[PDB]
Scaffold this active site. Structure first.
Site, PDB file in Angstrom:
ATOM      1  N   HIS A 170      36.134  42.446  38.835  1.00  0.00           N
ATOM      2  CA  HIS A 170      36.084  41.829  37.485  1.00  0.00           C
ATOM      3  C   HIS A 170      36.798  40.486  37.536  1.00  0.00           C
ATOM      4  O   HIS A 170      37.308  40.137  38.620  1.00  0.00           O
ATOM      5  CB  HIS A 170      36.659  42.773  36.429  1.00  0.00           C
ATOM      6  CG  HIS A 170      38.148  42.883  36.364  1.00  0.00           C
ATOM      7  ND1 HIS A 170      38.959  43.048  37.473  1.00  0.00           N
ATOM      8  CD2 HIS A 170      38.975  42.893  35.294  1.00  0.00           C
ATOM      9  CE1 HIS A 170      40.229  43.156  37.073  1.00  0.00           C
ATOM     10  NE2 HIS A 170      40.244  43.101  35.740  1.00  0.00           N
TER      11      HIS A 170
ATOM     12  N   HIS B  46      39.437  39.137  36.056  1.00  0.00           N
ATOM     13  CA  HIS B  46      40.911  38.933  35.943  1.00  0.00           C
ATOM     14  C   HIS B  46      41.479  38.543  37.313  1.00  0.00           C
ATOM     15  O   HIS B  46      40.932  38.939  38.351  1.00  0.00           O
ATOM     16  CB  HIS B  46      41.623  40.162  35.375  1.00  0.00           C
ATOM     17  CG  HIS B  46      41.402  40.365  33.926  1.00  0.00           C
ATOM     18  ND1 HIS B  46      41.564  41.595  33.358  1.00  0.00           N
ATOM     19  CD2 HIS B  46      41.079  39.506  32.925  1.00  0.00           C
ATOM     20  CE1 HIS B  46      41.337  41.507  32.061  1.00  0.00           C
ATOM     21  NE2 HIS B  46      41.028  40.241  31.769  1.00  0.00           N
TER      22      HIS B  46
ATOM     23  N   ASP C 192      43.880  39.559  39.104  1.00  0.00           N
ATOM     24  CA  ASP C 192      44.247  40.658  40.038  1.00  0.00           C
ATOM     25  C   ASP C 192      43.056  41.033  40.927  1.00  0.00           C
ATOM     26  O   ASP C 192      43.274  41.696  41.937  1.00  0.00           O
ATOM     27  CB  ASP C 192      44.913  41.858  39.365  1.00  0.00           C
ATOM     28  CG  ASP C 192      44.173  42.500  38.214  1.00  0.00           C
ATOM     29  OD1 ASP C 192      43.288  41.831  37.607  1.00  0.00           O
ATOM     30  OD2 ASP C 192      44.526  43.652  37.904  1.00  0.00           O
TER      31      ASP C 192
ATOM     32  N   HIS D  13      37.363  48.135  30.389  1.00  0.00           N
ATOM     33  CA  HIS D  13      38.573  47.306  30.599  1.00  0.00           C
ATOM     34  C   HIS D  13      38.228  45.836  30.337  1.00  0.00           C
ATOM     35  O   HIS D  13      39.042  45.140  29.699  1.00  0.00           O
ATOM     36  CB  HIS D  13      39.106  47.486  32.024  1.00  0.00           C
ATOM     37  CG  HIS D  13      40.131  46.469  32.370  1.00  0.00           C
ATOM     38  ND1 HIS D  13      41.365  46.378  31.724  1.00  0.00           N
ATOM     39  CD2 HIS D  13      40.131  45.513  33.307  1.00  0.00           C
ATOM     40  CE1 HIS D  13      42.069  45.409  32.280  1.00  0.00           C
ATOM     41  NE2 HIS D  13      41.338  44.845  33.229  1.00  0.00           N
TER      42      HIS D  13
ATOM     43  N   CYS E  35      40.177  48.135  37.567  1.00  0.00           N
ATOM     44  CA  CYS E  35      40.984  48.230  36.333  1.00  0.00           C
ATOM     45  C   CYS E  35      40.243  49.048  35.280  1.00  0.00           C
ATOM     46  O   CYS E  35      40.791  49.237  34.179  1.00  0.00           O
ATOM     47  CB  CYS E  35      41.414  46.855  35.858  1.00  0.00           C
ATOM     48  SG  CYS E  35      42.220  45.873  37.144  1.00  0.00           S
TER      49      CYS E  35
ATOM     50  N   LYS F 131      41.773  54.303  34.543  1.00  0.00           N
ATOM     51  CA  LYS F 131      43.041  54.214  33.777  1.00  0.00           C
ATOM     52  C   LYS F 131      43.407  55.610  33.299  1.00  0.00           C
ATOM     53  O   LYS F 131      43.157  55.952  32.158  1.00  0.00           O
ATOM     54  CB  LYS F 131      42.876  53.235  32.608  1.00  0.00           C
ATOM     55  CG  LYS F 131      42.790  51.769  33.001  1.00  0.00           C
ATOM     56  CD  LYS F 131      44.133  51.184  33.403  1.00  0.00           C
ATOM     57  CE  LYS F 131      44.057  49.765  33.907  1.00  0.00           C
ATOM     58  NZ  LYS F 131      43.343  48.899  32.943  1.00  0.00           N
TER      59      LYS F 131
ATOM     60  N   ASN G 257      46.154  46.629  29.798  1.00  0.00           N
ATOM     61  CA  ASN G 257      45.939  45.371  29.038  1.00  0.00           C
ATOM     62  C   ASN G 257      44.614  45.449  28.297  1.00  0.00           C
ATOM     63  O   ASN G 257      43.560  45.495  28.978  1.00  0.00           O
ATOM     64  CB  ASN G 257      45.959  44.148  29.957  1.00  0.00           C
ATOM     65  CG  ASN G 257      45.410  42.905  29.297  1.00  0.00           C
ATOM     66  OD1 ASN G 257      45.556  42.714  28.077  1.00  0.00           O
ATOM     67  ND2 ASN G 257      44.767  42.061  30.101  1.00  0.00           N
TER      68      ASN G 257
ATOM     69  N   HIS H 270      45.949  50.152  39.462  1.00  0.00           N
ATOM     70  CA  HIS H 270      47.367  50.026  39.038  1.00  0.00           C
ATOM     71  C   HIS H 270      48.084  51.369  39.039  1.00  0.00           C
ATOM     72  O   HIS H 270      49.179  51.446  38.434  1.00  0.00           O
ATOM     73  CB  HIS H 270      47.457  49.345  37.677  1.00  0.00           C
ATOM     74  CG  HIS H 270      46.863  47.987  37.629  1.00  0.00           C
ATOM     75  ND1 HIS H 270      47.291  46.939  38.437  1.00  0.00           N
ATOM     76  CD2 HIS H 270      45.884  47.496  36.853  1.00  0.00           C
ATOM     77  CE1 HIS H 270      46.592  45.856  38.141  1.00  0.00           C
ATOM     78  NE2 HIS H 270      45.736  46.172  37.151  1.00  0.00           N
TER      79      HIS H 270
END
Ligand SMILES: Cc1oc(C)c(S(N)(=O)=O)c1C(=O)O
Ligand code: NA
Ligand SMILES: [Zn+2]
Ligand SMILES: [Zn+2]
Length: 221
Positions: free
Chosen positions: A75, A77, A79, A137, A156, A159, A165, A195
């Site tokens: 994605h 982002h 990270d 996400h 991400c 989860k 976030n 994460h």
């Protein structure tokens, strides 16, 4: 002062790379990506946050005799994408979905040099599959499936204990998206979230429970 980049063997031909950032409110956040080895070729599944850690990652594999064939970013982002510019500068093919590249441009970020459309995409035939479960996400989030070892990189989207976030999330779609992923990858032996710790197919059900609760919370004043 951040924890050093970690590279840990997860399975035959599969390494987890862990890079670290301080996130206001979230503390010192580990970000897991993969390196997948096909023959003597290495594929980065997400880049570290930084150019410097992307270089440390690439150099680790190149020193051991692997050729970096490409990166795929799950994605937009940072990270997942922080190292694309550095990879581009070294003429290493970078991949993202058309939607991820659109959201990179919208965010004022360097784009992947290679793009793909549709729901299922083979980065490497029979070895590395990209699947779009729908928005969650982020609008663009994809997962990466390794058919041989039954390993799902969830990024991400996975989860299990809380959504993290929500700034770019589609909370209305995430439950439907998580139902589709859960239906498709029950056979997963390992599920690798961005994460939190590696787990099994149960992380798909836990993610669905968190998405349902998140949507409920979003409907409160
Ligand atoms: C815990 C966390 O830290 C960061 C920096 C992110 S993300 N992928 O939204 O940037 C998230 C997340 O929810 O994925
Ligand atoms: Na490139
Ligand atoms: Zn994200
Ligand atoms: Zn993240």
């Amino acid at each position: 002062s951040l924890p050093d980049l970690k590279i840990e063997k997860l399975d035959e031909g599969v390494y987890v790379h862990t890079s670290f950032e301080e996130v206001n409110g979230w503390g010192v956040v580990p970000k897991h990506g993969l390196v997948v080895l096909v023959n003597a070729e290495a594929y980065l599944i997400d880049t570290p946050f930084t150019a410097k850690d992307t270089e440390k990652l690439v150099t680790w594999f190149v020193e051991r005799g692997y050729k970096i064939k490409g990166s795929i970013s799950s994605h937009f982002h940072s990270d997942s994408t922080g190292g694309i510019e550095w990879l581009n500068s070294r003429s290493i093919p970078t991949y993202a979905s058309e939607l991820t590249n659109e959201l990179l441009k919208k965010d004022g970020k360097v784009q992947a040099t290679n793009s793909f459309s549709g729901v299922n995409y083979w980065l490497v035939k029979n070895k590395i599959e990209v699947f779009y479960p729908g928005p969650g996400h982020t609008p663009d989030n994809v997962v990466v499936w390794l058919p041989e070892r039954k390993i799902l990189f969830g990024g991400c989207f996975i989860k299990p204990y809380g959504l993290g976030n929500l700034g770019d999330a589609n909370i209305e779609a995430w439950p439907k998206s998580a139902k589709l992923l859960k239906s498709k990858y029950g056979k997963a032996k390992l599920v690798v979230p961005s994460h939190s710790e590696v787990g099994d197919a149960s992380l798909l059900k836990l993610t669905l429970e968190q998405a349902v609760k998140g949507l409920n919370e979003s409907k409160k004043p």
